[PDB]
Curated annotation (Swiss-Prot), chains A, B, C, D:
InterPro entries: Flag_FlgI. The gene is flgI. One of its GO terms (cellular component) is bacterial-type flagellum basal body, distal rod, P ring. PANTHER family: FLAGELLAR P-RING PERIPLASMIC PROTEIN FLGI, FLAGELLAR P-RING PROTEIN. Pfam families: FlgI. This is Flagellar P-ring protein. The keyword Signal applies. It comes from Salmonella typhimurium (strain LT2 / SGSC1412 / ATCC 700720). Belongs to the FlgI family.
């Protein structure tokens, strides 16, 4: 696996942008403004900013405008000329956003500063039906401000691991130590590896580029079972080991001569799958069987309800 | 890939224009002015600007006029004589904009200055039905003001990368360094490359023209999976690697002998596709299976809900 | 079994994050705000933070917004640039969260400090139906604060065992003592093993990485039976031993010549399963039979109602 | 039988944790808050702790939240980083807890101190129907405080027997005396055996580990019959002896020539079973027959109504 596939850089981080705006067009299917006054209020605010002053006492029963919230994603090292994608989601009573248009929404971050301006056409999908109050605009926001970053300062860069592991951190440190000279990398914990980098933006970029594509062997992570129980999904890891036991579950019986099937000890994932398949059960029954076994041991893994 | 296909220029940036206007004609299907007084108010304002003063107390039940918002796109280095396309979207209660005409809308930017004037005929499309409250006018706006730009000043131009990558920035810098002499380009971060350019508009334009068409080999970007879950779409990258595991999902069973299918370790995208296809599942089930696996590792990629 | 599969590290611990937020989009199926005023109140608070001040007296009957609680999981040694998964669960009257979007929720820990900011798109599953008021966002929260940790201090690390056992702790201590020199590890109790580690982050990480993958033979844990009685599941351990007895249960009779079946003494799990299967009973009857036997001895194991 | 299978250690004891919390999600099927005000009150308390102050006069008719009680199990020698399973049970009017999530419940012991914090996803089972107001979370609570224990102090450890017996205590003491030197173990009563242990945590752990796996022959415990009479279960011990008698029960007659069957003297459990089976009776009749015989002697065992 490449280093980039399991590790992020300390200075490279993403930021979240938010904003409020209006979507026009829509072929009806807009907000019922009698229940969403803020749509009309913000439309009037925009019109006043453009040069039209609507009288205070007005019906304002328009159905081609929907008030929406836009979520963006400030990319690392973003420049002013860059364009980023945005997600537009209806707020009030809008039935659909099929062919609407966003109107210059100023996107704001955690520090309440306008970082981008979003405007574009919504794309939504055409029984599993599509979500038609939520759309995406590709390159629908233009950045206006730059985050001051500390990349290229000092001489230590923290490669931050995903899915923390002392062994994986040691493997990454050793791989970098073989590639470069002695003392190039040093593991700080199960998640961070400090690499000594020369001063200067260019040389740091070159070193990170060379490091990122580098291949590292992945040690066996952990015996882990994932039970969702909300989407009816069960996933078992490669290192999951199963211990000999006996399991009895409602309405289940041996094929053949009754209930209380036996489960054999199995050190391989294929053997674990075969043993759990001999115990004929649906995934819904499988979750209960797995939890009951884990309560008694009998399952050499940790199971997480996800 | 050409440099232009993955990189923008620092001085070359796009601006967003907005405006409010009226669309006339429409074969009925206009605003219900009893619920949208601003349509009548702005029509009266336009008539007064032309020389007709409507009395204050009037019915104003006209159905051939629709109040619309126009969105434009100020192109880089735009001149006064240029014409740009605009998007016209209904505001109030208009049923359609099939054959309407826009009436000299002054388009405004973020700094509230009129940059273009938009006037033209709307084009809209003729069960998947077309959006007939949203249209486009080709060359429907004429520019009137020029943005002061800093292009051609100094001696450093920032080639700004899309889809930030330290390796891609290093590749671009190296390619430019091979093409030109030493020190021509220098990578500043994962997204910016500073190229040293001679003074003068003509020589900067020549250098950028020569650089833009240049071919650069694209390194493997990243193992990444995209799940939309709103349009029912799943996309997997070329570098997505799949680790051996066992997956159980509701109503799914081995073809053949029951639930809890096995997924083999696979380092190739074709092998990943084959392994996930042996697990017979619809895309809706595939999203849940992929998320559950990623929770347990078992999927050597990062998945983003888009 | 690997040491990592049955032991956690003292400094490596997980923390729980909580937060409150809003989900927008949803294709209707949102909160009935007449019964959930806090949804509208917090939406108004967010709008005021963005720059829109809704009047106090408003209908606020919007059905595209749902108030939700987000639960996160602060990983050990977490860095600021890291992203973690979150679980979004509806609070009020929301019918579904099929295609919603979370809006910058500040996640808080036990000490009431904001540790992460969560924003992203919800993924929910497509008779066993899926839970559609509960979803998960993968990498849907970005960390903002770092927990001060004491890892890399002192010279003693406590390997903490899961499923406490004096014999397992002694086995782990002996295995480490064979691998390293004398006095490297010392068992403190049935659950803790103190390993002497050299000073420094790098060397502690290296020692823990070498120790974690190490194989240790697992002694027979304990004779234990698990009865759930809520999911209808019975699990029996490998060491469960069965003593000779006679059992009579309602509507059960010998196959063949009446009630009061006999159960033979059996020192093997397979023999125990055969003896309990000769007594033809469903798991529901099996729980009562097992509890009744344990009341009389006759069952060389402890049974836990789980 | 291993010593661990019939004996607990004096210092090794379990503690019970309790707590109150909320479960969110649930696909409706939550509390009817008009009849359970404490659900809304505690939700408001949590929101205030997060930073949202709900007005005092509110409808609070939300059906996605259920007030629950969580029961945990503080394991012996528990550390701060450990995780333990919890049981979540509905309190008010909740119809189900199918896919809910627990929200940071502080678990408390007998001394009213917070010992763990519980948060996670509930797992419940999918005519014998499952209990869907009661679920379990695996590793759903993280410990925060450590019980001060006296293990490793003094030089005497009390092996405490389950199912008290003077003969079993003597057998355990003799077995330890053969394994170690003279005076190593001394029986104090039918339930306690004092073993002399050297000072120090390490040596005490080693001695207990060596002792625990040791095999000891189990003497015949006692002639005992268990009648449940609530689940319709009758269990008879291995030492149950039956004396010659005559039994008459309603609607029962000799197969063949009428009522008042004879029961032969039988010193073996198989012979006892055969004698009671010749008397053709259901378990319900068997309980009455056994109690009536025991009133007259005729049954060389003690019967307990369990």
């Amino acid at each position: 696996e490449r280093i980039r596939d399991l590790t992020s850089v300390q200075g490279v981080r993403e930021n979240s942008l938010i904003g409020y705006g209006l979507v026009v067009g829509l072929d009806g299917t807009g907000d019922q403004t009698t229940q969403t006054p803020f749509t009309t209020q913000t439309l009037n605010n925009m019109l006043s900013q453009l040069g039209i002053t609507v009288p205070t006492g007005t019906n304002m029963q328009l159905k081609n405008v929907a008030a929406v919230m836009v979520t963006a994603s400030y990319p690392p090292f973003a420049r002013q000329g860059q364009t980023i994608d945005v997600v537009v989601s209806s707020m009030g009573n809008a039935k659909s956003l099929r062919g609407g248009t966003l109107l210059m929404t100023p996107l704001k971050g955690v520090d309440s500063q306008v970082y981008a301006l979003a405007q574009g056409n919504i794309l939504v999908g055409g029984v599993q039906v599509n979500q038609l109050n939520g759309g995406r605009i590709t390159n629908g926001a233009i950045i206006e401000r730059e985050l001051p970053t500390q990349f290229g300062a000092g001489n230590t860069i923290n490669l931050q691991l995903n899915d923390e592991d002392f062994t994986m951190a040691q493997q990454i440190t050793d791989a970098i130590n073989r590639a470069r000279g002695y003392g190039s990398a040093t593991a700080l914990d199960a998640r961070t590896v400090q690499v000594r980098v020369p001063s200067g933006n260019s040389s740091q970029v070159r070193f990170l580029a060379d490091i990122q594509n580098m291949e590292v062997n992945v040690t066996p992570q952990d015996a882990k079972v994932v039970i969702n129980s909300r989407t009816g999904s069960v996933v078992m890891n490669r290192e999951v080991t199963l211990d000999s036991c006996a399991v009895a579950q409602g309405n289940l019986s041996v094929t053949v001569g009754g209930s209380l099937q036996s489960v054999r000890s199995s050190a391989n994932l294929n053997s674990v799958v075969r043993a759990l398949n001999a115990l004929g059960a649906t995934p819904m029954d499988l979750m209960s069987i797995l939890q009951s076994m884990q309560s008694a041991g009998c399952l050499r893994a940790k199971l997480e309800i996800i």
